[PDB]
Amino acid sequence: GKVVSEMIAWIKSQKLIAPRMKDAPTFYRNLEEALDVRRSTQSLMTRGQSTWKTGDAIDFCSNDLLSLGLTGELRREFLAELARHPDFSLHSGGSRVMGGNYDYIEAVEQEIADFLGAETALMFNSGSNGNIAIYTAIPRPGDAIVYDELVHFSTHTGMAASLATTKVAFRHNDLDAFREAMSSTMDSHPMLQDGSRSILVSVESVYSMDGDVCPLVEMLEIAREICPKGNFAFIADEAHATGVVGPRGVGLVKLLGLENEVAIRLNTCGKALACTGSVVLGNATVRNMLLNYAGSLVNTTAPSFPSVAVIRAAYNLMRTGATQKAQDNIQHLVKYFFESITSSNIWDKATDLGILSIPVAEDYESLDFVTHIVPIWTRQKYNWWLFFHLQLAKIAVVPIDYPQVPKGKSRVRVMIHAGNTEEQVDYLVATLCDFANEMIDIEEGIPKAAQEIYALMAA
Amino acid sequence: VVSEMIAWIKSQKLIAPRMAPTFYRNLEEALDVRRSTQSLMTRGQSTWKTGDAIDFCSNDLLSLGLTGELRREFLAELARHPDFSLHSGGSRVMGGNYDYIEAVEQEIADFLGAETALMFNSGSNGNIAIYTAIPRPGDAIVYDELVHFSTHTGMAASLATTKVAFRHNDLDAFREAMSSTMDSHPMLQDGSRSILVSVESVYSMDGDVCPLVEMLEIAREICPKGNFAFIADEAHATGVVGPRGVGLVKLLGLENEVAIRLNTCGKALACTGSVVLGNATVRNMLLNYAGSLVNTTAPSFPSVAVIRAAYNLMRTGATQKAQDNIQHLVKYFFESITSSNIWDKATDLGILSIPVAEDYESLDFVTHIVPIWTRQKYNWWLFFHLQLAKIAVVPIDYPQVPKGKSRVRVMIHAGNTEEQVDYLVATLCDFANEMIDIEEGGEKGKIPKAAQEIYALMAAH
Numbered sequence: 001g002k003v004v005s006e007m008i009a010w011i012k013s014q015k016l017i018a019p020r021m022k023d024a025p026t027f028y029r030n031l032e033e034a035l036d037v038r039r040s041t042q043s044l045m046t047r048g049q050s051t052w053k054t055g056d057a058i059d060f061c062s063n064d065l066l067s068l069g070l071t072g073e074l075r076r077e078f079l080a081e082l083a084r085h086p087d088f089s090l091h092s093g094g095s096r097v098m099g100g101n102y103d104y105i106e107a108v109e110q111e112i113a114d115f116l117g118a119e120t121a122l123m124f125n126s127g128s129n130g131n132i133a134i135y136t137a138i139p140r141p142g143d144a145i146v147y148d149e150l151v152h153f154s155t156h157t158g159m160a161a162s163l164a165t166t167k168v169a170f171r172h173n174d175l176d177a178f179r180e181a182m183s184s185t186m187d188s189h190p191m192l193q194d195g196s197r198s199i200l201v202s203v204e205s206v207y208s209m210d211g212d213v214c215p216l217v218e219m220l221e222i223a224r225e226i227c228p229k230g231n232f233a234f235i236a237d238e239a240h241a242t243g244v245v246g247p248r249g250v251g252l253v254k255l256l257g258l259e260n261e262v263a264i265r266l267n268t269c270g271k272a273l274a275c276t277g278s279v280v281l282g283n284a285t286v287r288n289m290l291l292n293y294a295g296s297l298v299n300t301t302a303p304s305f306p307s308v309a310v311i312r313a314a315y316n317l318m319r320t321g322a323t324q325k326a327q328d329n330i331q332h333l334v335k336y337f338f339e340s341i342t343s344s345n346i347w348d349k350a351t352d353l354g355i356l357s358i359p360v361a362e363d364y365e366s367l368d369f370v371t372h373i374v375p376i377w378t379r380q381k382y383n384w385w386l387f388f389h390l391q392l393a394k395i396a397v398v399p400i401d402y403p404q405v406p407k408g409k410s411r412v413r414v415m416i417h418a419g420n421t422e423e424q425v426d427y428l429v430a431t432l433c434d435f436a437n438e439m440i441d442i443e444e445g446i447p448k449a450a451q452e453i454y455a456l457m458a459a
Numbered sequence: 460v461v462s463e464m465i466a467w468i469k470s471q472k473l474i475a476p477r478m479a480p481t482f483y484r485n486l487e488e489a490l491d492v493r494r495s496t497q498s499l500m501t502r503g504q505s506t507w508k509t510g511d512a513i514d515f516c517s518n519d520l521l522s523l524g525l526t527g528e529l530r531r532e533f534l535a536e537l538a539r540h541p542d543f544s545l546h547s548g549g550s551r552v553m554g555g556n557y558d559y560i561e562a563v564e565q566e567i568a569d570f571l572g573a574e575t576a577l578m579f580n581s582g583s584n585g586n587i588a589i590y591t592a593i594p595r596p597g598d599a600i601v602y603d604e605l606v607h608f609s610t611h612t613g614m615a616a617s618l619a620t621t622k623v624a625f626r627h628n629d630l631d632a633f634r635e636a637m638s639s640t641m642d643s644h645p646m647l648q649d650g651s652r653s654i655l656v657s658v659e660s661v662y663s664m665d666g667d668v669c670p671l672v673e674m675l676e677i678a679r680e681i682c683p684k685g686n687f688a689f690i691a692d693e694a695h696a697t698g699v700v701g702p703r704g705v706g707l708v709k710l711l712g713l714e715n716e717v718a719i720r721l722n723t724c725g726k727a728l729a730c731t732g733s734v735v736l737g738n739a740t741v742r743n744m745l746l747n748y749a750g751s752l753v754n755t756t757a758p759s760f761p762s763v764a765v766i767r768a769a770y771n772l773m774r775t776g777a778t779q780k781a782q783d784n785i786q787h788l789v790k791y792f793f794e795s796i797t798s799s800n801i802w803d804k805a806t807d808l809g810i811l812s813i814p815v816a817e818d819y820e821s822l823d824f825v826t827h828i829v830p831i832w833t834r835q836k837y838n839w840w841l842f843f844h845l846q847l848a849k850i851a852v853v854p855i856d857y858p859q860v861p862k863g864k865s866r867v868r869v870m871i872h873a874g875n876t877e878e879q880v881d882y883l884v885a886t887l888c889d890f891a892n893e894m895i896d897i898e899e900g901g902e903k904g905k906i907p908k909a910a911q912e913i914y915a916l917m918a919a920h
């Protein structure tokens with residue numbers, strides 16, 4: 001219904017356009033050629049995945065992790081906050097370092113810093129812009145940056161525009177690769193050996209595409225061994241930790257008691273906190289560096305009063321414990337899914353033959369917590385078939401494919417939210433087991449859902 | 460005013476003497492570079508917000524923030540959507556699209572005469588998306604040297620390997636850049652790649668206006684095959700320029716001649732955000748190739764509702780009186796200052812320079828941006844003089860502008876008054892006479908009175 005119409009519109013958007021542009025102006029011809037590159041791999045994006053918003057599919061795909069958007073709970077606190085300031089000055093006035101600073105945003109920043117165990121907080125209009133500010137303003141000429149290969153797009157962008165001339169990736173979440181990257185970097189830079197410059201380590205506390213967790217404590221001990229003079233600093237992107245991990249949602253750094261061991265933290269508002277924005281946490285030196293050397297921040301308008309107030313409302317709900325039941329339900333639902341799927345009659349065979357692969361589901365019991373992110377893998381030649389199967393079963397997931405990941409690394413990403421139900425998880429597990437069975441049957445002799453999409457294409 | 464100045468003074472005191480782990484020591488060393496030129500930024504210029512100084516400083520050009528007019532429409536908009544879904548859901552191309560934001564985009568496009576619109580959280584992000592998604596390999600970009608920081612950043616991250624600046628607002632320089640770029644690229648000569656031209660409608664730190672009609676004629680001359688596209692950054696034009704605030708492009712009837720336009724919400728529209736305007740091909744290019752957009756959360760409902768409210772105020776004519784009042788007040792300032800007894804002498808000697816005030820009468824309209832120059836060695840003294848007179852302005856210095864090109868930026872707002880302009884004119888004339896007097900007295904160590912007070916407070920703390 002809505003699923004089929006969203007899917008027909010998607011199919012039509014992949015039809016090549018350059019053959020109809022032969023007499024158009026050069027400028028538009030060449031843009032439609034560039035769009036045709038993405039169309040030619042059925043990867044052109046247009047209107048996204050929205051069947052869940054109309055209730056026509058289960059939401060196993062959105063970033064509304066605590067369901068604070070879905071329930072209106074954030075909206076009600078946001079409106080309460082605006083009602084406590086009936087004469088509020090909506091407009092900031094300009095740049096945060098020119099006409100745009102004001103008492104309310106500084107007070108809200110300090111509330112958040114205090115709740116999260118940091119000396120200061122600086123507000124941005126997104127997590128992406130916070131990472132841009134960090135890696136353009138913080139690294140010094142002669143510094144080196146050592147980063148997990150799977151840091152966010154905005155970190156890669158920020159590092160590429162950085163003053164630091166040494167940037168080293170290491171294999172994702174691999175402690176031996178981290179040690180080798182640190183060792184090799186320290187040993188090849190005289191200014192790092194003598195301690196006149198620093199190694200900046202960039203990690204995510206929870207990884208957007210894989211759902212695993214940064215071994216922060218272990219990486220800190222390694223950093224101290226390779227850098228006896230202490231000339232290093234960690235930067236932790238907690239986009240997918242805040243609200244989900246730790247008591248009252250303080251995130252992974254505070255949960256591990258590392259708030260004084262991590263120089264820079266980024267906590268964003270676009271996922272569990274159900275709005276937009278972010279704060280960068282650090283001491284006054286870090287904050288003043290951002291205000292003076294992050295060109296991106298200097299040259300943009302400071303947040304309006306409503307944008308600050310909605311962030312305060314999110315933190316209000318967290319700080320007062322109003323989110324703890326939802327945060328706990330994520331844990332329950334995710335483990336509920338792990339137990340159900342790994343207990344299915346087909347789980348062993350499908351994992352053996354490579355038909356299904358859910359790495360976060362392996363050894364989840366040896367974890368102090370699970371995360372809301374469940375990437376699900378099949379054979380690379382089956383990935384669209386898996387998505388089509390879930391889609392036609394009215395389960396909304398996000399397909400992950402080139403250009404978001406390399407060709408041949410495609411998957412689907414299931415997001416488990418606080419407002420999901422055990423019945424929905426039951427339906428997800430059954431639906432997954434159907435797909436696994438259909439493929440096991442085919443290999444021992446096109447799946448039905450793909451047949452259906454391919455029929456729509458032929459139409 | 461004094462508390463702001465004291466805090467500013469202390470912030471310039473060198474910290475590295477006390478510095479400490481390597482990481483923090485090197486940071487405060489970098490901060491000390493700014494402190495040593497008394498140019499560290501911290502809390503900005505805010506004395507006007509509490510009424511302790513006149514606002515000749517802020518970007519609240521139509522006074523929609525000051526009057527509460529935007530706030531009231533924004534809250535009425537929210538009340539008309541009592542069950543609104545606050546959270547977008549994710550990225551605009553994944554979980555974060557929804558009907559309300561698509562409808563508000565199209566309403567803004569229709570108001571501005573464009574085919575389609577795409578919403579961003581800022582004008583900066585809009586420019587980042589444009590220059591990272593739109594230029595193709597083999598294209599050239601020809602840009603005014605004074606485009607915005609975000610445009611410089613985006614162009615550096617561009618796939619275009621030819622990028623050519625031209626001298627600010629200079630039609631001869633533009634023609635030279637276009638013709639030399641055409642003359643050296645065979646694929647521009649044969650029409651198979653494009654020249655992208657990047658300008659601002661109204662220039663943030665200079666207040667002059669792009670001669671857009673004249674640039675389009677030159678482009679058509681140099682590119683007879685039509686293989687060019689204009690990109691107009693209208694940050695300082697929406698709300699202030701054109702009938703009902705539609706901006707410069709629409710004022711000139713060039714909606715179909717300028718392929719890409721940026722209209723931002725952080726100035727006259729008194730909030731935050733932007734839209735990029737163009738046809739569906741342009742919009743699809745941003746959605747697919749601007750990684751900054753693909754990898755960020757789509758706007759919340761209130762962020763879209765406050766922008767809708769600002770455009771609804773404009774489209775219902777509720778900003779036209781304020782827009783006309785800016786024009787009156789700026790022209791009133793120009794007539795007053797250029798009528799001052801000391802004007803001719805101060806401008807001849809270079810004690811005062813206000814280029815936008817010369818030949819203002821021959822303009823079809825004026826802008827709110829009034830950059831005021833003195834001698835470079837007096838610019839902080841000028842700011843001190845205004846600040847102590849309880850007049851708030853923004854002091855502009857490197858890195859915002861090149862070394863040796865510092866100035867102060869007055870912004871005129873609909874909410875200002877002729878009496879406030881009178882006091883500004885008088886304060887500027889006092890400053891001019893005092894500095895003329897010092898220069899003629901032959902005592903090279905003599906400090907003006909405002910700067911004396913600042914130096915006294917520095918001596919204390």
Ligand SMILES: C=C/C(=N\C=C1\C(COP(=O)(O)O)=CNC(C)=C1O)C(=O)O
Nearest residue numbers: 126127128152208239270550754755756
């Ligand atoms: C675009 C949504 C999204 N990813 C966003 C992240 C950001 C950007 O934050 P925002 O600009 O949206 O505020 C910074 N770091 C990390 C680790 C992220 O996952 C997702 O669907 O996972």
Ligand SMILES: C=C/C(=N\C=C1\C(COP(=O)(O)O)=CNC(C)=C1O)C(=O)O
Nearest residue numbers: 299300301581582583607663694723725
């Ligand atoms: C933020 C301060 C400000 N200038 C902002 C401009 C931007 C960025 O817009 P935002 O990111 O703030 O939305 C793009 N283009 C132009 C021409 C601008 O003047 C000013 O005080 O001049």
